[PDB]
Design an enzyme around this catalytic site. Sequence first.
Site, PDB file in Angstrom:
ATOM      1  CD  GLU A  46      -1.922  -2.243   1.606  1.00 48.33           C
ATOM      2  OE1 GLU A  46      -0.881  -2.569   2.209  1.00 48.33           O
ATOM      3  OE2 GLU A  46      -2.868  -3.049   1.387  1.00 48.33           O
TER       4      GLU A  46
HETATM    5  N1  LIG Z   1      -7.996  -3.998   3.687  1.00 48.18           N
HETATM    6  C1  LIG Z   1      -8.609  -4.681   2.699  1.00 48.18           C
HETATM    7  C2  LIG Z   1      -7.849  -5.526   1.858  1.00 48.18           C
HETATM    8  C3  LIG Z   1      -6.363  -5.783   2.030  1.00 48.18           C
HETATM    9  O1  LIG Z   1      -5.814  -5.523   3.133  1.00 48.18           O
HETATM   10  O2  LIG Z   1      -5.756  -6.347   1.084  1.00 48.18           O
HETATM   11  C4  LIG Z   1      -8.501  -6.224   0.848  1.00 48.18           C
HETATM   12  C5  LIG Z   1      -9.841  -6.086   0.622  1.00 48.18           C
HETATM   13  C6  LIG Z   1     -10.600  -5.251   1.412  1.00 48.18           C
HETATM   14  C7  LIG Z   1     -10.011  -4.532   2.444  1.00 48.18           C
HETATM   15  N2  LIG Z   1     -10.887  -3.664   3.211  1.00 48.18           N
HETATM   16  O3  LIG Z   1     -12.080  -3.664   2.945  1.00 48.18           O
HETATM   17  O4  LIG Z   1     -10.410  -2.935   4.064  1.00 48.18           O
END
Ligand code: A1IAX
Lengths: 278, 278
Positions: free
Chosen positions: B45
């Site tokens: 990220e």
């Molecule tokens: N944090 C995520 C991630 C990830 O950490 O890869 C993936 C899909 C959805 C969310 N979300 O909804 O927060």
Amino acid sequence: MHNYVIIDAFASVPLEGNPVAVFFDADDLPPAQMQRIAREMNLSESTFVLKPRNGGDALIRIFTPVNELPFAGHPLLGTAIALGAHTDNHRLYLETQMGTIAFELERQNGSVIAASMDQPIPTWTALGRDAELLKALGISDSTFPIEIYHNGPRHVFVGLPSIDALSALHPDHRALSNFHDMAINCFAGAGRRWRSRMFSPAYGVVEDAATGSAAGPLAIHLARHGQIEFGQPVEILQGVEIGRPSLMFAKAEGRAEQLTRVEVSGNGVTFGRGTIVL
Amino acid sequence: MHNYVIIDAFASVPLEGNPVAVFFDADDLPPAQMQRIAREMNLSESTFVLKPRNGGDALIRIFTPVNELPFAGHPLLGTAIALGAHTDNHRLYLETQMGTIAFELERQNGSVIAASMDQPIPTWTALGRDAELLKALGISDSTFPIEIYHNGPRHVFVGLPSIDALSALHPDHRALSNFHDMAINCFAGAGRRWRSRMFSPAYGVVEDAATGSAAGPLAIHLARHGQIEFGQPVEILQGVEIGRPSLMFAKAEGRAEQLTRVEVSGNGVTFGRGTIVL
Ligand SMILES: Nc1c(C(=O)O)cccc1[N+](=O)[O-]
Ligand SMILES: Nc1c(C(=O)O)cccc1[N+](=O)[O-]
């Protein structure tokens, strides 16, 4: 500590082309640490600039996030452009596992904006898996023979009858994963101007922005199959469909049985610069 | 131009933990440009620090290379640690799509070395695909019930009978790709000390270093299944097998039917700092 620059290779505009991180003054880094740094950065490749060992200007080590490579096009182009900022020389000789690669640097007011490299001369043969590959790509046939070229990596070429047909491809990436140690390069165009898309599960690439080591082979392929002559340059535009348009220029001199030079050139631009704590 | 820092979250040593790029003063960047920058960086990220909209200290937008996320553990921890260098406040309130998240900053001589966050309270249920998942992981059974937790992402937990059995896992990543919108977290340990490994084709992760959004759920899971009590903290060591050891600390307060707080903390360290040209 070490300084680095992020170069977008085969582009003149940041956020286009194909990124590479270039680390300067890397002689104090053991190779295991270079590999860990490349994994930390997670770019297609990170390169490391070392003192030369055989009469070139510098020795360049090239790492993906997982392994060292002996040769790679966009990483070396980006390295030459980054290093060119620190020399007045018109050309740069970069040592690699595949030998010393000559670059010609192109400047405006001291800034290196482009470079041209002389690549390893590839070898090639028929892939011999046409039905399997065409099914994975979702098409019935190629235009030109499906041949696989070797210049370090391996690159297969599949020809499409129009640029619109190239853009319409939606390959089955799971089916493509049965093609080991190679990248699949699909192309279309005419005359001087060609478009390409590259896919490679084997090399960790869903779809690549700029496959510099495929540009030289593509020029050979087009010349062998009568679309250009040996000695004529082509402009290859890659990465449009993924929003990373990249321009690669390539020319192959000689004849198929006696190639004398394979040249690939492109612009490069700095996206960022920084320092790491080790 | 924009300054950024690369933080290794859930580690005190560079090249350990899980990296995040944090971009400061990002209010001039349209979201499409933030997404392009996250793709350029290609880290798990990249986050972007914006002026607050609801009484927090800052609004943080979180992007993978492909999509924006509403909440993520290691990216927010790294962001709090990076931003803490630019304030004297003991705590930082970071706004996200899931609401305003409170951090408690831990300093030594002005340097923020760790932080603790209050996570969204998860929900959970049985996965109901046990035989399929166990086959994909290469094992016959779980220790504790196979349940899937939701706090933004979804995290499934599969228990192994020893740390050595956890390290021996060699999952079939193709079989795991049939598990959509979730990550698979395998764990082993006892008492205060647990080990984890996380795999997620759905989230673009072969094996993760530090899955901060799974740490809170794991504490709940261990408390529900009688291995710890609610209100007791655990130390979770992840990423050993991939050479990115990461320490996450987690505690869940209340009872399963009425959770009042889920806290996750970790160290963070700067790997690098730089500037981008846009
Ligand atoms: N944090 C995520 C991630 C990830 O950490 O890869 C993936 C899909 C959805 C969310 N979300 O909804 O927060
Ligand atoms: N350059 C490569 C790559 C790549 O570009 O991903 C992959 C495998 C081998 C080589 N090679 O031998 O040079």
